[PDB]
Design a protein around this ligand. Structure first.
Ligand code: 2I4
Ligand code: IHP
Lengths: 102, 102, 102, 102, 102, 102
């Protein structure tokens, strides 16, 4: 479970940029008195998993063994037409070619 | 029915994330004077139902007994690109494959 | 007629939450100096008519006699991605097969 | 002409709902010093011509002589995705069959 | 070049309404200390060139010598769903027939 | 890497228009105490690479080394439906024909 303030309740806003949410995660973490390792691996597992399925999955899309910067860039394209454009095109064709999903 | 300020009146806004909604709900539940036995289940029954069909529908999808956490992670993903994007993936085949609905 | 401050000037913004629109509907109505009988049916005839061509459309879909609980929620489906989502599914699947309308 | 703050320079923000438009139209007309009768002949032609090419064209779409009630019925659904939707419903179905326009 | 605060640095936000952009243009212009003749010709060459390729192109579309009122009327349709709508419709059919561009 | 407040961290938000991004960038560049040569090229390497996948790739789209006016016009058009649309048409044309990508 994850209570307020605690990074365990820190989740990216679907509209919130990963560039922002990523920050909310680390600053909010400053709000928590977690052991540094408890705060870092948190910054790892809590960040990605709580990073707005869009960014969060993008992180996975980015191929694990990622750098915070990359997912920052891929998940940064989220919020502006970069998303509403690329995702739109991708979903637009996610189904065009892959419509049969099982 | 559900009068204002009561958890019964509590409802995830059409765009309100499961995360935010789950916050005003429980706070509202604090605002309500139902025992924990009456509140905790309101937290169960009212939450899923009042939680905005986007979340509410996911909620039923995850599978009865979905950890509040699971819906807490999925339902919340809704909002900006969260619903614009992911759903575009399903909205896209919702008409292409499922255009005929009966 | 229907000048401002009356329930005859109570409309749901297109993106407006039904729960919101309907909220001002009745506060305005409270201000509207009609009899219980002249105020209450407004709730019915003006709510459906002035409620966002989409919610207005939904209400008919909800099947008259419906408790405001259902129209409020279906209409609650409006605003967030839910509105674009449900509509995208029907209008998109309407313009595909039903593109021919006479 | 039409200088700022005069009903003449009163124009529905592209997105400014007609409801917002008609309220601000009436907020700047009321503000505008045109005879009581002039305001009446302003409230007529300026209202339809300045109300956002969408709410406006709608006012013209309802067929001149459209009770201000009908505009409010149609140009009220403007702004939300209900518009992006209802508009798409026709524009989307207008391009498929009517793409060739001369 | 065009330094900050100058009308040379004044550009319509990609989403910024022409009505808006044109307002700050002239407000900012006053800030710029250009001779009346210099401000008047900036008002013309900088207004169109720095007016958001949507409006900026519209202005040209309106055809040179276009009255500020026409740019204001055509570039005002830019911003909300009024645009996304009109533009999507043309772009949509542009790619249908005109997809081949050379 | 690029720490907080540095022009290195500095990035065109997804909604931050290039004309604005470039505005906080330069203000933020002044904030980081660097030599002229340093700021001279920071303004370059950090302005295009941190430049919002849309504006940034636009710069590269225009052709790197592009005049600030070329990236500015091109990126000052990135923000609203002038963009969310111009792109929707193209990305749409990217997945219609070019959906197959390898
Ligand atoms: C690919 C598809 C399957 C379909 C096939 C063709 C299509 C159709 O007929 O369905 C043409 C219309 C489009 C392109 C939809 C896709 C969806 C989009 C969208 C609903 C997408 C989300 C966008 O909003 C944002 O990005 C958020 C934003 C408003 C900028 C903010 O921050 O406030 C908005 C602008 C609302 C559009 C309007 C155009 C349409 C309907 C297309
Ligand atoms: O007017 P608000 O209630 O504050 O809503 C705004 C508005 O969106 P709409 O087009 O739906 O009216 C913004 O647009 P502008 O007012 O600047 O035109 C938009 O941002 P964009 O300009 O980037 O499209 C932003 O949406 P978001 O930041 O989610 O993309 C959204 O704010 P909220 O939904 O957060 O209220």
């Amino acid at each position: 479970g994850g209570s307020p303030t605690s990074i365990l309740d820190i989740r990216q806003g679907p509209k919130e940029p990963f560039r922002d949410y990523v920050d909310r995660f680390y600053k909010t973490l400053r709000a928590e008195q977690a052991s540094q390792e408890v705060k870092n691996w948190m910054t790892e597992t809590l960040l990605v998993q709580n990073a707005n399925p869009d960014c969060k999955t993008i992180l996975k899309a980015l191929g694990p063994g990622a750098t915070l910067e990359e997912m920052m860039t891929a998940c940064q394209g989220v919020g502006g037409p970069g998303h509403k454009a690329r995702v739109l095109a991708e979903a637009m064709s996610q189904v065009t070619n892959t419509a049969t999903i099982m």
